Write a protein that binds this ligand. Structure first.
Ligand SMILES: NS(=O)(=O)c1ccc(C(=O)N2CCN(Cc3ccc(F)cc3)CC2)cc1
Ligand SMILES: [Zn+2]
Length: 259
């Protein structure tokens, strides 16, 4: 019912999910000079185990790696979070050129891709779905990707894309440590927001890392080789699967650092 094409793209989502015009929608354009330095925030800690990954899937909207979230082994804690949130899955948003692809932008600048590590408040809610509807239910850590030098650990992931090039396909993806996709800095911007895809619920505490990671153009190209379409269909490459910046509506963006 929704996608990233000319007829079902982000500009039309509100026709189906009215909350798309809400007061805490994501993503947003981060004006670094207007972010509020908040030294009162606790250190952001991403405590990830190496073998919690389950599979890699092309769900028609992105490529997603799902995790075992039975306990609090792989969690994010600190920063603006009151407690630990368990990692459920990570996925990406990307474009067709280096000038576009990320959802969040910084001072008007977009990156070729953005990684989203999705976590939920399992201590408070029974299911991820239950959490995805509550204001304090989710915590998504966003990491910008820039193109430059090849990323060693990313190779395992980009090499796996061929087997999930078609929509609705999946493959086993064991022992991939999402910590390998994090930058050396834990500085970030945070603000109250929403899921960036339908149902667009305003249940996400966003934590956007300041430092991007880089992958090579070859690796980025592997993402663009994915398809929005199934095997027996006219091929349409999965690109520009991002939602543009939404109105801030008076929300305060906090920063764990001084610009
Ligand atoms: N990019 S993001 O904001 O980081 C993000 C994070 C989590 C999710 C996520 O797992 N699904 C949300 C969507 N739902 C499907 C859905 C769609 C429409 C509905 F009305 C209900 C449920 C599956 C779970 C999606 C996007
Ligand atoms: Zn996302």
């Amino acid at each position: 019912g929704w996608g990233y094409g000319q007829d079902d793209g982000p500009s039309h989502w509100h026709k189906l999910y009215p909350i798309a015009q809400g007061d805490r929608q994501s993503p947003i354009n981060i004006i670094s000079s207007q972010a509020v330095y908040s030294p009162s925030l606790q250190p952001l800690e991403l405590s990830y185990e190496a073998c919690m990954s389950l599979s890699i899937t092309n769900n028609g909207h992105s490529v997603q790696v799902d995790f075992n979230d039975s306990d609090d082994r792989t969690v994010v804690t600190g920063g603006p979070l009151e407690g630990p949130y368990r990692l459920k899955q990570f996925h990406f948003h990307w474009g067709k050129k280096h000038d576009v692809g990320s959802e969040h932008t910084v001072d008007g600048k977009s990156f070729p891709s953005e990684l989203h590590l999705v976590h939920w408040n399992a201590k408070k809610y029974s299911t991820f779905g239950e959490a995805a509807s509550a204001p304090d239910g989710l915590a998504v850590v966003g990491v910008f990707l820039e193109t430059g030098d090849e990323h060693p650990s990313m190779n395992r992931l980009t090499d796996a894309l061929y087997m999930v090039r078609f929509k609705g396909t999946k493959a086993q993806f064991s022992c991939f440590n999402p910590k390998s996709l994090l930058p050396a800095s834990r500085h970030y911007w945070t603000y109250p927001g929403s899921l960036t895809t339908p149902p667009l619920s305003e249940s996400v505490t966003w934590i956007v890392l300041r430092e991007p990671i880089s992958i090579s153009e070859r690796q980025m190209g592997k993402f663009r080789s994915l398809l929005f379409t199934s095997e027996d269909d006219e091929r349409i490459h999965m690109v520009n699967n991002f939602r543009p910046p939404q109105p801030l509506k008076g929300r305060v963006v906090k920063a764990s650092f001084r610009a």
